[PDB]
């Protein structure tokens, strides 16, 4: 029981996985936005 609780996830893993997927999507969106911003650099 101690080894099982040692994992860290107190709440059920359903909402944990939902939040992890949301964070992964947000990270992908942020990376794509940063790439699109740093790519289109044609001003002077």
């Amino acid at each position: 029981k101690l080894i099982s609780t040692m994992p860290g996830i107190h709440l059920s893993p359903e909402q944990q996985q939902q939040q992890l997927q949301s964070l992964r999507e947000q990270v992908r969106t942020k990376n794509e936005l940063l790439q699109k911003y740093k790519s289109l650099c044609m001003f002077e």
């Binding site: 099982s4 994992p7 860290g8 996830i9 893993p13 996985q17 992964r24 990270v27 990376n31």
Partner: protein, 47 residues
């Protein structure tokens, strides 16, 4: 020989599901830490 067998099967299934959930939570925490580090580096560079 039905109630005890069903209870044991449910306990084994719950243990397997708990182990799988712990593994998935660990993997999700590792991926989230990596994504958070990447986003923090990107935000520092952008700032």
């Amino acid at each position: 020989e039905n109630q005890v067998l069903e209870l044991l099967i449910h306990r084994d299934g719950e243990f397997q599901e708990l182990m799988k959930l712990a593994l998935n939570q660990g993997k999700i925490h590792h991926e989230m830490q990596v994504l958070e580090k990447e986003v923090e580096k990107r935000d520092s560079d952008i700032q």
